[PDB]
Design an enzyme around this catalytic site. Structure first.
Site, PDB file in Angstrom:
ATOM      1  CG  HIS B 248      47.394  45.229  38.846  1.00  0.00           C
ATOM      2  ND1 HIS B 248      46.510  44.694  37.956  1.00  0.00           N
ATOM      3  CD2 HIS B 248      46.871  45.003  40.073  1.00  0.00           C
ATOM      4  CE1 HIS B 248      45.501  44.133  38.608  1.00  0.00           C
ATOM      5  NE2 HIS B 248      45.681  44.329  39.910  1.00  0.00           N
ATOM      6  CG  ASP B 249      45.070  47.031  42.834  1.00  0.00           C
ATOM      7  OD1 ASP B 249      44.291  47.223  41.839  1.00  0.00           O
ATOM      8  OD2 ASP B 249      45.017  46.049  43.662  1.00  0.00           O
ATOM      9  CD  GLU B 276      50.524  42.770  39.382  1.00  0.00           C
ATOM     10  OE1 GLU B 276      49.473  42.519  38.705  1.00  0.00           O
ATOM     11  OE2 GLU B 276      50.530  43.353  40.505  1.00  0.00           O
ATOM     12  CD  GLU B 308      47.853  44.718  34.780  1.00  0.00           C
ATOM     13  OE1 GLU B 308      49.034  44.303  34.961  1.00  0.00           O
ATOM     14  OE2 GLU B 308      46.899  44.431  35.522  1.00  0.00           O
TER      15      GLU B 308
HETATM   16  N1  LIG Z   1      47.497  49.144  53.045  1.00  0.00           N
HETATM   17  C1  LIG Z   1      47.208  47.865  52.864  1.00  0.00           C
HETATM   18  N2  LIG Z   1      47.704  46.953  53.681  1.00  0.00           N
HETATM   19  C2  LIG Z   1      47.458  45.620  53.546  1.00  0.00           C
HETATM   20  N3  LIG Z   1      46.698  45.084  52.584  1.00  0.00           N
HETATM   21  C3  LIG Z   1      46.143  45.930  51.680  1.00  0.00           C
HETATM   22  C4  LIG Z   1      46.366  47.373  51.787  1.00  0.00           C
HETATM   23  N4  LIG Z   1      45.739  47.906  50.786  1.00  0.00           N
HETATM   24  C5  LIG Z   1      45.144  46.918  50.076  1.00  0.00           C
HETATM   25  N5  LIG Z   1      45.371  45.745  50.624  1.00  0.00           N
HETATM   26  C6  LIG Z   1      44.902  44.410  50.186  1.00  0.00           C
HETATM   27  O1  LIG Z   1      45.387  43.995  48.914  1.00  0.00           O
HETATM   28  C7  LIG Z   1      44.442  43.139  48.314  1.00  0.00           C
HETATM   29  C8  LIG Z   1      44.337  43.736  46.918  1.00  0.00           C
HETATM   30  S1  LIG Z   1      44.476  42.584  45.627  1.00  0.00           S
HETATM   31  C9  LIG Z   1      44.189  40.821  45.900  1.00  0.00           C
HETATM   32  C10 LIG Z   1      45.343  40.086  46.644  1.00  0.00           C
HETATM   33  C11 LIG Z   1      45.821  38.641  46.343  1.00  0.00           C
HETATM   34  N6  LIG Z   1      46.937  38.739  45.407  1.00  0.00           N
HETATM   35  C12 LIG Z   1      44.879  37.588  45.768  1.00  0.00           C
HETATM   36  O2  LIG Z   1      45.034  37.123  44.658  1.00  0.00           O
HETATM   37  O3  LIG Z   1      43.874  37.033  46.455  1.00  0.00           O
HETATM   38  C13 LIG Z   1      43.152  43.258  49.127  1.00  0.00           C
HETATM   39  O4  LIG Z   1      42.707  42.067  49.797  1.00  0.00           O
HETATM   40  C14 LIG Z   1      43.422  44.437  50.043  1.00  0.00           C
HETATM   41  O5  LIG Z   1      42.797  44.432  51.307  1.00  0.00           O
END
Ligand SMILES: Nc1ncnc2c1ncn2[C@@H]1O[C@H](CSCC[C@H](N)C(=O)O)[C@@H](O)[C@H]1O
Ligand SMILES: C[S@@+](CC[C@H](N)C(=O)[O-])C[C@H]1O[C@@H](n2cnc3c(N)ncnc32)[C@H](O)[C@@H]1O
Lengths: 347, 342
Positions: B248-249, B276, B308
């Protein structure tokens, strides 16, 4: 205790209003009616009838993301036609943001005040009005005092005025329709009258009316020339001109109980026996519903508590509690619409 | 057109949440709990037990004024004024067991930094590539967070508590984990996610996969093994993958690459687990709609890149990555677990 409903249920409390305030800022409700009565369009359509959105491809989807939320809030109706799109339509509490055909009044100006960054900044410091002695959310949140900020800050002045202004055009139009106790009167005097407007209007549905406007010198100093109106400067706390019946719309709620006595005294001591201090507030119902009469009081009791918390909205009990302790025979309150009264204090 | 009807409907929209924030900020909801089951305590009494307000003569005068609004709101119980908790209110009292509640997370959703960004929502409909957070604040969100600690803690406390609650849900409803020997949490964070799971299903070997800089700080968990990297280049190998609040990011483009990498590092009979909130095909005044709308907005304000999505859209990402099966698994008020089977 189902957390993952209590979320979507409390989580939206902040979202709904700031989504709303973007629709307004982008003049969505207007552009929607510039398509017809009982109509329905896509965000794609509304993003086309939008000048600053030329050369932003995402304009349409980003907009569709906002409207979906209002459309879910009830603040908009919504329906999908046959490749399936979301098409949007107005509602009761949503037509109240289409600026009128003639005079242009709407709640837009009213609602942009309430949901204004200056105000919210001030809300964010409410906590304090309980914790600290005399603290003012407004003061805690901003350089200094509200009149200070508002002097040195034009756009905050615009919004606080334009709001209280459109909201008067509306609060009055329905003082007209109900109450008609304006014609066994020939003379009326607006204490804290602003710059007339209130009376300007009155002495024009009642042309047989000696319209007088009483406010602070610096206010009437600016105040334009209405035929019907003669202006008078002073300090209503020190003494009020003489007149038949007197008018107190949105004066008594700015002020404490003692300062409401001292004013109402000076108001009597300059009223002929037979005349009456008319009081136009939103009244605080004794039991508090989801009832609009209950929000029409609570909303401003808050804004007061945020910006000038020495202020207070009051129960009809609490208003005759004042009328009396001044020295007023009657205290005869007239319900008007959804909590808007004309308490009448009789000498 | 009843101007003074709609004047309240819309006028209250901004009074409730700021009023509620004030109640939370002052403890109210707990203090009314700290007076025994189905109580009904009073403005004066609640002030009474509120130390930071023990020298404000007007205190209770002002408090009653806020509570009223909550009463009318229905977040509290009238009882005439004698106020008391409810279904809604109860979710705001730090628990006996773990001190968790929805507070930390709402206090977040309504934090000045976020509302401030909200104020610039219009800008994402007008200027191309514009970020409300950015318009509103000096920097980008990460630079800003790097340099303002109290914002960055509020975002933590907020996400933290929220996950707990979301996991309590997922655990109570989803079997899936029982016949799993290995779990790779892609975007795992500090591995607090995959650890909680391995704790509940200990014949599963946890692997936490995130950015080096994140991993570099993760604590040590039983049966969790941290692996740093960049999930867009390659993901480690695993029997099964967990993707929580990752898809969703990101744009559709970037998603199917993350998904192609997941597939390539899967066996056959391997599956990816999308956790999600799904966006309903029909929106409505219901938890399953608002549980997807609140984020979708927060995204626009703090990350317009993200969105979303709908059980069908997620499925379309799956197939495009080359998975052969999508099994949508409803959990609670819009929460899903989506399985892409390879
Ligand atoms: N290219 C990449 N490789 C590995 N991790 C990544 C990334 N891009 C983003 N992230 C990671 O994805 C996470 C985003 S969202 C939070 C993640 C987890 N579902 C929770 O509930 O705690 C972050 O911690 C970020 O560092
Ligand atoms: C909320 S406004 C009233 C609005 C006006 N009745 C209307 O409906 O447009 C309060 C008014 O009180 C006036 N006022 C405040 N202190 C005053 C004083 N000492 N003497 C006279 N007027 C005063 C202000 O100048 C201001 O115009």
């Amino acid at each position: 205790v189902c957390y993952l409903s209590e979320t979507a249920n409390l989580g939206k409390l902040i979202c709904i209003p700031m989504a709303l305030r973007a629709a307004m800022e982008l003049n969505v409700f207007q552009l929607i009616s510039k398509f017809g009565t009982d109509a329905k369009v896509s965000a794609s359509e509304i993003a086309s009838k939008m000048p600053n959105a030329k050369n932003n491809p995402e304009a349409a989807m980003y907009l569709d993301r906002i409207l979906r939320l209002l459309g879910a809030s009830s603040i908009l109706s919504v329906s999908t036609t046959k490749v399936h799109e979301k098409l949007y339509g107005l509602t009761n509490s949503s037509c109240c943001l289409v600026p009128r055909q003639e005079d242009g009044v709407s709640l837009v100006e009213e609602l942009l005040f309430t949901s204004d960054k200056v105000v919210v900044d001030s809300f964010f410091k409410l906590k304090c009005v309980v914790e600290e002695k005399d603290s003012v959310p407004f003061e805690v949140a901003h350089g200094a005092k509200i009149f200070e900020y508002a002097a040195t800050e034009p756009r905050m002045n615009q919004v606080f005025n334009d709001g209280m202004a459109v909201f008067s055009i509306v609060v009055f139009e329905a003082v007209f329709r109900v109450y008609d106790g304006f014609l066994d009167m020939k003379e009326l005097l607006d204490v804290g009258g602003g710059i007339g407007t209130s009376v300007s209007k009155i002495v024009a549905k009642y042309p047989l009316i000696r319209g007088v406007n009483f406010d602070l010198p610096h206010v009437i100093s600016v105040a334009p020339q209405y035929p019907g109106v003669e202006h008078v400067a002073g300090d209503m706390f020190e003494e009020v001109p003489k007149g038949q019946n007197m008018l107190l719309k949105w004066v008594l709620h700015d002020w404490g109980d003692e300062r409401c006595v001292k004013l109402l005294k000076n108001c009597w001591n300059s009223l002929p026996v037979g005349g009456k201090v008319l009081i136009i507030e939103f009244v605080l119902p004794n039991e508090l519903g989801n009832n609009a009469e209950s929000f029409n009081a609570l909303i401003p009791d808050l804004l007061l508590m945020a910006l000038n918390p020495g202020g207070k909205e009051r129960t009809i009990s609490e208003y005759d509690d004042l009328g009396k302790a001044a020295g007023f025979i009657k205290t005869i309150p007239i319900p008007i619409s959804n909590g808007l009264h004309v308490i009448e204090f009789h000498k």
